[PDB]
Design a protein around this ligand. Structure first.
Ligand SMILES: Nc1ncnc2c1ncn2[C@@H]1O[C@H](COP(=O)(O)OP(=O)(O)NP(=O)(O)O)[C@@H](O)[C@H]1O
Ligand SMILES: [Ca+2]
Ligand SMILES: [Ca+2]
Ligand SMILES: [Ca+2]
Ligand SMILES: [Ca+2]
Ligand SMILES: [Mg+2]
Length: 465
């Protein structure tokens, strides 16, 4: 291996490891009853939501963890850590305190068109990203949509991937799963694809605007027979003042024919979404972002891995708020990835300076892509953007450097060894590459990386030219 072969990804920080709950977390309170527990990190004091699942029959959970570790989008849940005991599996998740969207529906009872569009565009953005990564949720409903915070513009987070699946473009899914009000009729017929999720969102949008479901009944039997027929109506007084554009989107998402049904990507682009979200937006720019991004060119892989962990797993909502809003703006199609053309079009928000019609901008975009694209997938992913654009004063705080070092130092002896370096990303392979990656930053010739050496390497990376 060479260093140019290594890839820093958010998923590499999650691996099946042996651990005890009491060793690293303190129990605060029971959040769900399978058990959701609010816990406090014994070192950083950060509170996290831990899903305790009791103990191949355990293959379903491992496949879910394999999906969960990949999830990197402003509108999708984040998995902080994963560990196991002799009896239980521990899914350490980022805690969201704004409640479920279900709670807001019960309290508000109905949403205006602008509010409904803002929420639904976020669900569609999350779903567009899932579908592009061959993931189908299969249980989208207001109970599985959490609000980030209790703050006014708090982001929607898609949660509960328990019924999720990796789908194939050539094969239809057969498992009848979901919730009575939200289930697509083709799921009931045991022959469906990812369009089943678009149906679920259509039902959610109908509820937001009207305050009642499109397929109702006193029993599940009544609801499902209405779902099977696929017949619903806007002929109710709750719909009198609702625009033609909102009804048009619902009709396309609740299109009985899966092939003719709007995709999550196309629904995000719908004229009603565009009009309503433009009303809400009617906006800050980044300073010295291009110079900061250029620092990552040819940078040490251990330094990339450290900063990626600090930015993606160690930063608060308050620290990333402005970055997430800029990312969402540049990400025109809301797929959670910034492609070459998106970077070109939204360049004025990155550089700060205004772009004229007259080449240089395309060269700078390819330089940014070469530096920030840590996994070499051709895009600047969400966590990659947060890493390369974050201000130094916030990203390089002592507590973040301490936690990043502690994560990589598996045995906790105060030194990152050759075995641990290969484990941060390649565990089985023995190579002079790991030894040489360390020797380049080793100041006391002991063949290990101590906290001081770790900090100096990161400081050299984010230092002025
Ligand atoms: N990351 C999280 N942050 C905060 N709360 C969470 C998080 N994940 C799950 N919860 C809450 O944990 C509680 C139980 O979730 P869970 O057991 O997965 O579903 P449930 O018991 O069927 N309730 P529901 O999701 O409304 O159908 C719910 O109140 C969730 O909102
Ligand atoms: Ca995009
Ligand atoms: Ca990338
Ligand atoms: Ca060690
Ligand atoms: Ca050393
Ligand atoms: Mg649930």
């Amino acid at each position: 291996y060479f260093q140019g072969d290594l890839q820093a990804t958010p998923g590499m920080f999650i691996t099946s490891k042996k651990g005890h709950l009491s060793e690293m977390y303190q129990r605060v309170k029971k959040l769900g009853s399978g058990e959701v527990l609010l816990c406090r990190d014994k070192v950083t004091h950060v509170e996290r939501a831990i899903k305790i699942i009791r103990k191949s029959s355990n293959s379903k959970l491992l496949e879910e963890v394999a999906v969960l570790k990949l999830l990197d989008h402003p509108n999708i849940m984040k998995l902080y850590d994963f560990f196991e005991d002799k009896r239980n599996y521990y899914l350490v998740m980022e805690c969201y305190k704004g409640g479920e969207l279900f709670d807001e529906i019960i309290h508000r009872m109905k949403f205006n068109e602008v509010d409904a569009a803002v929420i639904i565009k976020q669900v569609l953005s999350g779903v567009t990203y899932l579908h592009k990564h061959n993931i189908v949720h299969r249980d989208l409903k207001p109970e599985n949509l959490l609000l980030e915070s209790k703050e006014k513009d708090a982001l929607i987070k898609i949660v509960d991937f328990g019924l999720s699946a990796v789908f194939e473009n050539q094969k239809k899914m057969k498992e009848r799963l979901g919730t009575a009000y939200y289930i697509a009729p083709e799921v009931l017929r045991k022959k469906y694809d990812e369009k089943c999720d678009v149906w679920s969102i259509g039902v959610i949008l109908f509820i937001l605007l009207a305050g009642y479901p499109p397929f109702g009944g006193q029993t599940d039997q009544e609801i499902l027979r209405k779902v099977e027929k696929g017949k619903y109506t806007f002929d109710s007084p709750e719909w009198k003042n609702v625009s033609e554009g909102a009804k048009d989107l619902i009709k396309q998402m609740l299109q009985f024919d899966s092939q003719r049904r709007i995709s999550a990507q196309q629904a995000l682009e719908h004229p009603w979404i565009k009009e309503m979200c433009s009303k809400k937006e009617s906006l800050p720019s980044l300073a010295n972002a291009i110079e900061n991004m250029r620092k990552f060119q040819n940078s040490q892989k251990l330094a990339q891995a450290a900063l990626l962990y600090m930015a993606s797993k160690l930063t608060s909502q308050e620290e990333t708020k402005e970055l997430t809003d800029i990312f969402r703006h540049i990400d025109k199609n809301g797929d959670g990835q910034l492609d070459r053309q998106e970077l070109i079009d939204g360049y004025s928000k990155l550089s700060g300076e205004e772009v004229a019609v007259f080449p240089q901008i395309e060269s700078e975009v390819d330089a940014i892509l070469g530096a920030a694209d840590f996994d070499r997938n051709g895009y600047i992913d969400y966590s990659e953007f947060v890493t390369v654009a974050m201000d130094r004063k916030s990203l390089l705080s002592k507590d973040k450097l301490e936690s990043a070092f502690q994560k990589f130092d598996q045995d906790g002896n105060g030194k990152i060894s050759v075995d641990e370096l290969a484990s941060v990303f390649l565990d089985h392979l023995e190579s002079k590459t790991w030894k040489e990656m360390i020797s380049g930053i080793d100041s006391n010739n002991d063949g290990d990386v101590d906290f001081e050496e770790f900090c100096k390497m990161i400081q050299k990376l984010c230092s002025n030219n």
